[PDB]
Amino acid sequence: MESEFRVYSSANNCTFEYVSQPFKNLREFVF
Amino acid sequence: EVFNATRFASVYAWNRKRISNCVADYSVLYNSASFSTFKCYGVSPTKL
Numbered sequence: 001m002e003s004e005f006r007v008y009s010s011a012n013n014c015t016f017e018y019v020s021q022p023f024k025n026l027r028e029f030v031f
Numbered sequence: 032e033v034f035n036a037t038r039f040a041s042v043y044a045w046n047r048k049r050i051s052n053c054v055a056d057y058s059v060l061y062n063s064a065s066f067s068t069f070k071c072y073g074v075s076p077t078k079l
């Protein structure tokens with residue numbers, strides 16, 4: 001019933017966090 | 032909220048915090064005029 005878990009992720013530093021609001025349309029991304 | 036917490040950290044376990052996406056509102060810590068400890072040797076309060 002649960003599929004939103006996480007594995008390990010010791011999170012030593014994680015000093016940057018950008019939690020923010022975000023036939024199918026072709027999703028194109030440039031990184 | 033950080034400065035007005037209910038529990039203060041101990042001496043042996045010093046709590047270290049890192050600040051991101053924030054601004055230095057110096058006026059809030061400067062309006063009380065309680066800067067009794069002014070041993071600012073090597074710096075100036077005008078070049079802030």
Ligand SMILES: *[C@@H]1O[C@H](CO)[C@@H](O)[C@H](O)[C@H]1NC(C)=O
Nearest residue numbers: 011012013014015047048049
């Ligand atoms: C991140 O900061 C923590 C603070 O306790 C430190 O232990 C850790 O080594 C740092 N990791 C880095 C610099 O990526």
